[PDB]
Amino acid sequence: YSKDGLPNKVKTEDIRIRAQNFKSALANLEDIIFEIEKPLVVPV
Amino acid sequence: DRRRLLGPAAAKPMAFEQELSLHTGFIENCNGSALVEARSLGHQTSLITAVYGPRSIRGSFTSQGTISIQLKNGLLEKYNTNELKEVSSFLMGIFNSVVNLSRYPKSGIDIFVYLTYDKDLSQISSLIPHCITSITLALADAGIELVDMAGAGEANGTVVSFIKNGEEIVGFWKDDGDDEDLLECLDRCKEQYNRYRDLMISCLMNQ
């Protein structure tokens, strides 16, 4: 339903690319990188 | 009744060319489903069959599968519950020969057949070949291994189910009618079987 309140049939292709976008994004997850302070370690 | 809403108990109820339509796999609640609609003369029948399984039974030591069939009244309350159990027992005597039970050890297959709409312008004898058609479709759609396609026909109240291309019989239902119709009913139902068989096979391939 749009702003006017009129029913709009969602295309059968619309949901297809939604699955293509989801399956592609879920297959390769971005590696979560977080750093922790280590005052006990020293360089060479 | 504390289970459902039956309303006032002091009240009383109201007092007053073969064509087929096959559809399968329209229910996502189960493993296999089927819709069968037949219209002939002044009598049409629409029923739905759902198949849930095969699902594992805990502690079961059965080396083969276990089939359970139950018929239900969807809308019109006509057939007696006692008679529904009888047909169910007849139907299970059929598919226990049809279904390859050796494939599902320690498992069980539940079959629900909903009798939705039946117009009539014995009695339940005519619906039997449609119940067999529905179940055989729902089982084949579900993935259950069937040794052969089960089908039947109704001739003068005499129902007989065939497999292996009508060469053998997996079920026989004779009620009322008359005598000496043995050879005739076997030939008339065999034509209905072959007709129902090809439409069933075509139904599974097309969709």
Binding site: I32 | P54, G59, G143, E145, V147, M149, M205
Partner: protein, 216 residues
């Protein structure tokens, strides 16, 4: 293959035995039933006959392994936990000497998985038990089960023996096996990720709980 490609349930595919003539010698093709097929008996000309008959609607596949295997592939059921397979499970309850779970999905072979659909509020789902000795190869004798698994945590394991017809026996001894997905405080907190093999941390609330983690 001189045999029908498409097969509905009840359709004749090929007889019991077969043979052909090549290189001046008779080659014997041995037809054996498979998933989707069933060897049954037919009668014709007053004489018995045995032939491979498909029981499921689909395409016929004739393959050979180092004999001709005849099977029918549909357009789940065949997939069942067998010794050596990898299975994703969920912890249902924790005891002191063991840890019982329930089987959700099973890893396929060359990742892809086979999800077993069942009702978790009934008990129809396959149940499995992970022994305390099968937790890790390191120190098999003394293992604290509380510091390894947790109710609700997802555990990737491998089935050793089926045992009886009730519970499956799994193990998380190797590196690629252990708790995969888990949350803080039995699922009340935020998501946690696997860092060390024996330590699971959460890069959100800074919470750290002791689990048995697998290798990324």
């Amino acid at each position: 293959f001189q045999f029908p490609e498409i097969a509905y349930p009840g359709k004749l595919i090929c007889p019991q035995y077969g043979t052909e003539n090549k290189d001046g010698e008779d080659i014997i093709f041995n037809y054996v039933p498979g998933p989707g097929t069933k060897l049954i008996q037919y009668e014709h000309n007053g004489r018995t006959l045995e032939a491979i008959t498909a029981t499921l609607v689909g395409t016929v596949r004739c393959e050979e392994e180092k004999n001709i295997l005849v099977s029918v592939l549909p357009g789940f059921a065949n997939n069942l936990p067998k010794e050596g397979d990898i299975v994703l499970t969920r912890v249902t309850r924790l005891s002191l000497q063991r840890a019982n779970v329930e089987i959700l999905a099973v890893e396929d072979k060359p990742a892809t998985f086979s999800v077993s659909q069942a009702s978790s509020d009934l008990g129809e789902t396959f149940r499995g038990i992970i022994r305390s000795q099968d937790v890790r190869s390191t120190d098999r004798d003394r293992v604290k089960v509380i510091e390894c698994f947790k109710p609700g945590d997802i555990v990737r394991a491998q089935v050793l023996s089926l045992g009886d017809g009730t519970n499956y026996y799994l193990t998380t001894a190797r590196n690629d096996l252990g708790v995969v997905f888990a949350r803080a405080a039995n699922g009340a907190g935020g998501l946690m990720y696997a860092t060390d093999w024996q330590m699971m941390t959460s890069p959100v609330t800074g919470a750290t709980e002791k689990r048995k983690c697998a290798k990324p």
